[PDB]
């Protein structure tokens, strides 16, 4: 009743195996309070800025950047929709063509935080000059505690 | 140079992010669909704390 | 037929005031090209420097 | 002379990344210190 609860606590005091089993039960119950897995998902476009302010670079500046954590193995799947394009970031040593129907993978890991610029490096029309690339790199704890909370529905 | 070529695949770790890059006329598109899960950080200290909370 | 507005002298003076500093929308700003401008590895950006 | 300049630049890069690791080891020690402080608070929270 209540003494049997107290007798269970006395058996916790006495038997080490029962103590370990109830510790494992405590660990099972604490994992039940852990929130479940949630999906992170986004789909945005990145366009060149037509007019820039001081502190921004003409031709190379976009409106929406790609935010990537540092010290993390990142897979980049590159493809296209209509013609050939090339995703080139010269500071990160990645330049791989975007082919319609292909899914070209890149393994990338960034050493330091910063803002890295790029352009498209495959001729694709009249406005080939005006498809720039900007990658913003932040720390992994910021990425996993603040940035991914912007994409929880 | 051959050694640098064969080092371009670096899949010897647990991958942490996937980003789908799509090239259009004339702009870029970025996609992601992953899952965020949480894990109790060093639970055995909490296990012992609960153990000494229940023993008295 | 088109001389861009980032080459005018007012833009150039306001850019020279900022320097080679890139803003970030999720983090404090960062110095661009930290090796050729010899920023030390303890300093990441101007706002995070906070000079003594 | 060219390889001397290259080795000089690589030396600066190695010192840069060493300083960055020295800095990055400092916040993560203070983070675990704050975690231990919260653990010491939760310890007396279940004993009072």
């Amino acid at each position: 009743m209540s003494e049997s609860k107290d007798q269970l606590k006395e058996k916790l005091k006495a038997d080490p195996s029962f103590r370990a089993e109830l510790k494992d039960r405590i660990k099972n119950a604490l994992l039940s309070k852990v929130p479940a897995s949630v999906p992170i998902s986004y789909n945005f476009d990145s366009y060149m800025l037509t007019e820039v302010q001081p502190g921004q670079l003409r031709v190379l500046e976009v409106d929406e950047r790609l935010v990537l954590p540092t010290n993390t193995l990142i897979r980049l799947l590159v493809t296209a929709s209509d013609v050939l394009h090339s995703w080139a970031v010269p500071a990160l040593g990645v330049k791989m063509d975007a082919v319609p129907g292909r899914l070209n993978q890149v393994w990338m890991s960034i050493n330091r935080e910063g803002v890295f610029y790029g352009q498209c490096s495959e001729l694709c029309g009249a406005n080939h000059s005006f498809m720039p690339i900007v990658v913003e790199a932040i720390s992994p704890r910021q990425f996993l505690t603040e940035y991914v909370k912007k994409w929880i529905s | 140079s051959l050694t640098l070529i064969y080092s371009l695949d670096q899949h010897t770790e647990r991958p942490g992010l996937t980003v789908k890059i799509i090239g259009r006329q004339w702009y870029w598109s970025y996609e992601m669909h992953d899952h965020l899960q949480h894990k109790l950080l060093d639970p055995d200290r909490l296990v012992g704390i609960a153990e000494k909370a229940l023993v008295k | 037929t088109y001389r861009p507005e980032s080459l005018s002298k007012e833009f150039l003076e306001e850019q020279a005031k900022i320097g080679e500093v890139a803003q970030r929308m999720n983090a404090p700003p960062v110095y661009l090209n930290p090796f050729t401008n010899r920023i030390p590895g303890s300093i990441l950006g101007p706002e995070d420097a906070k000079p003594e | 002379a060219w390889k001397t300049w290259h080795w000089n630049e690589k030396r600066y890069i190695a010192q840069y990344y060493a300083d960055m690791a020295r800095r990055e080891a400092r916040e993560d020690a203070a983070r675990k210190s704050a975690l231990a402080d919260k653990y010491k608070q939760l310890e007396e929270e279940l004993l009072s």
Binding site: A91, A137 | - | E20 | -
Partner: peptide
């Protein structure tokens, strides 16, 4: 990270692979 006026060589790097490429180029 970004190109600079009157620049001769490559840009600065943030991956070990890009640094290794530049090292190979200087060796050649």
């Amino acid at each position: 990270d970004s190109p600079q006026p009157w620049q001769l060589l490559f840009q600065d790097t943030a991956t070990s692979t890009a640094q290794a490429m530049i090292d190979l180029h200087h060796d050649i």
